[PDB]
Design a protein around this ligand. Structure first.
Ligand SMILES: Cc1ncc(COP(=O)(O)O)c(CN[C@@H](CS)C(=O)O)c1O
Ligand SMILES: Cc1ncc(COP(=O)(O)O)c(CN[C@@H](CS)C(=O)O)c1O
Ligand SMILES: [Cl-]
Ligand SMILES: [Cl-]
Lengths: 406, 406
């Protein structure tokens, strides 16, 4: 296998940290990824040597900073195979991107009596903005239900889609179940009704290549900090024909063409129309470095190593008594589980005591928890820098916990 | 004088940079400030040694990251003398903070037939969101006009304020003129009508102490990157009694209490109700370091040095032929000027050629330009790390430009 987990781990300084006296096993990348020194240092070097305002003054440092920013936009657009860099808007993250669509596109395209379709596995980020829109305009939020194995009940779609369905908002990969949804086919179906499709790609972009032209999605969102990048930065992709018709959301400097207190205000062109005020230039530089880092490893190399690691994990976990897994066998990135009747809060506390970082709780997916009739779950993320040894530590930990608490 | 500009400059690595072969004179801090290595390194060290998700999992690194974040919120609240840390919301910047108020507070408190009052010196960030609100609800945007010297025509306020005035939105310090407005007295007047007051403090917080209890403003906004901090982070302060009644703006994870696809969704408490999705944790750590750095220098020490430098600049500039200054004599931070009939774009290009970074154009204040009947202006910011020598370089440059282009 062409991927070298030991060379990659050497790029991540936090991975040398110790917790409760033992070496850290960081199994919470789905909540946020650790960052390589290449990403950390690119941001710091920008601040140390080339920092200035962008899209404003035209002196040397400002000119060069603005070019660096727009170069990141180009690099990002190539990463997802968008047709044009101008189809990408810099946002704080997946959550802000979804909210931008819900307001700018939703407010002018969804009216009383209409319906929107989400799924029962959606993260709150891809639920709440649509509930807010549905309440603003008097529309109905319809829900694709789950099967026990964590896949979508695709047979229900004929009854959910009708001529008043304006949008399907759907996750690419579940943050709990690891399910990858059949986006291409669902998007074909939605387009046959005249619906647009927003894809929540927050848990997809780090696991394999993503091609928004091949998908034909109308909107796609993801967050930098889960793609081994800095916080406070993400990407919203919107098909150019939709984007150029969308009205601004936030108002302020840089997104205007002209401002008058007697004759009103006119807007600049997309995507800058959607970027009011000073951007997170530092985070944009760091995001560019993160894309370069991931592209240098090769997403198909990453996918190969992670799928191998996940198969090993699922195999070893069979030797844990009374373990319940949630989701399908072909899961990406995350393993969701409970141990016997012990509360997830407790299982995660013990694991933390062993130096093992997992997330416990509802994982911002309360409807998903409700479907499985549990209050909470434990979750282990298995990212490209995690190791078989870390997997063994988790398995052994769960065995100890079962024995001690049985 | 207790401030040592040479020791301070030694903290700023970019200040050693060279531009067009000469030492950089960075006179554009009003657009964004350079950052000390204390700020740069605090963020980088966080990423290198303690990075994790906040307000989510409770394992060791996450617990410590969440505490660091909430400690910054506390430090920020003490910096502006807010009564409680829970009156501060983390935002992308001043612009996003104003938009949050315009939507969450504006949409439920400003109705058809109402009026809002801004001034003719406002930055677009404190104009456009109110124009958008006024168009959403059918309200009127009223304007306090300017005097020739760059002060507000305060005699007009009796005719602008009435019983339907819901909000005064007013800049603390102009980003062009350097005018500091009489906020305390204007806020007393506005409160007598039952109006609330949002203060745009983006150009105030780095120049002297700011005390929102003494001001009694209802909202106050500022940006981290102008306070020697990272990009992508800012602060919105809102009086607790107003904040706890405001509805959420963005929806998603972390701002909810419960989420149901059959029984709807309930919200968490302020300020977290206003912080949807993963925050800019990296920028928050860096902002905390920036507040500690500025507080260690002492804002009254900074104000003393800057006011001395500004007095020197205004004195030396008298020896530039055909220079027009805009604004009052007691200006803070920025000097706005034009040279003869030469376009500002050209004057700034020559200055850039001398290694001198100024901003030229409308400075996101087109109504202000209109009032002075010019298309554009040059602007020199004189921040706490700038020097008398840099001032001489600007004066000499403008003399050369006048001679060469006369
Ligand atoms: C499928 C999906 N969609 C949207 C989001 C929100 O991303 P933000 O960067 O917080 O805006 C996430 C967030 N992932 C984390 C944090 S709640 C978790 O599961 O631990 C996600 O998994
Ligand atoms: C008075 C005032 N109010 C709001 C803003 C907007 O801040 P943001 O951080 O871009 O959101 C600014 C922005 N200052 C810069 C950038 S446009 C300038 O004048 O060069 C300002 O001066
Ligand atoms: Cl502007
Ligand atoms: Cl949540």
């Amino acid at each position: 296998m062409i991927f070298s987990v030991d060379k990659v781990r050497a790029d991540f300084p936090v991975l040398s940290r110790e917790v409760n006296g033992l070496p850290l096993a960081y199994l919470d990348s789905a909540a946020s990824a650790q960052k390589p020194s290449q990403v950390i240092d690119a941001e710091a070097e920008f601040y140390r040597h080339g920092y200035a305002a962008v899209h404003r003054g035209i002196h040397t440092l400002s000119a060069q900073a603005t070019e660096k920013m727009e170069n990141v936009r180009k690099r990002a657009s190539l990463f997802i195979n968008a047709r044009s860099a101008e189809e990408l808007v810099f946002v704080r993250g997946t959550t802000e991107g979804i909210n931008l669509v819900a307001n700018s596109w939703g407010n002018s395209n969804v009216r009383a009596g209409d319906n929107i379709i989400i799924s029962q596995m959606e993260h709150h980020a891809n639920i709440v903005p649509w509930q807010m829109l549905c309440a603003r305009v008097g529309a109905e939020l319809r829900v694709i239900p789950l099967n026990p194995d964590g896949t979508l009940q695709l047979e229900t779609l004929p009854t959910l889609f009708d001529e008043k369905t304006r949008l399907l908002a759907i996750t690419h990969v579940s943050n709990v179940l690891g399910t990858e949804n059949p986006l291409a086919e669902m998007i074909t179906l939605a387009h046959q009704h005249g619906a647009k499709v927003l894809v929540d790609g927050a848990q997809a972009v780090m696991h394999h290549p993503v091609d928004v032209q091949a998908l034909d999605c109308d909107f796609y969102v993801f967050s930098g900090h889960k793609l081994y990048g800095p916080t406070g930065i993400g990407i919203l992709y919107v098909k150019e024909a939709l984007l150029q018709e969308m009205p601004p959301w936030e108002g302020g400097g840089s997104m205007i063409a002209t401002v008058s207190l007697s004759e009103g205000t006119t807007w600049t062109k997309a995507p800058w129309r959607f970027e009011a005020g000073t951007p997170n230039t530092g985070g944009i530089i760091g995001l560019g470095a993160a894309l370069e880092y991931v592209s240098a490893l090769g997403l198909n190399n990453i996918a190969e190593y992670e799928q191998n690691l996940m198969h090993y994990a699922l195999s070893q976990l069979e030797s844990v008594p009374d373990l319940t897994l949630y989701g399908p066998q072909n899961r990406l990135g995350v393993i969701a589980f409970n141990l016997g009747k012990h509360h997830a809060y407790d299982v995660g506390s013990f694991l933390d005591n062993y130096g093992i970082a997992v997330r416990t709780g509802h994982h911002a997916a309360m409807p998903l928890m409700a479907y499985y009739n549990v209050p909470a779950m434990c979750r282990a993320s298995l990212a490209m820098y995690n190791t078989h040894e870390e997997v063994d530590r988790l398995v052994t930990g769960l065995q100890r916990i079962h024995r001690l608490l049985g």
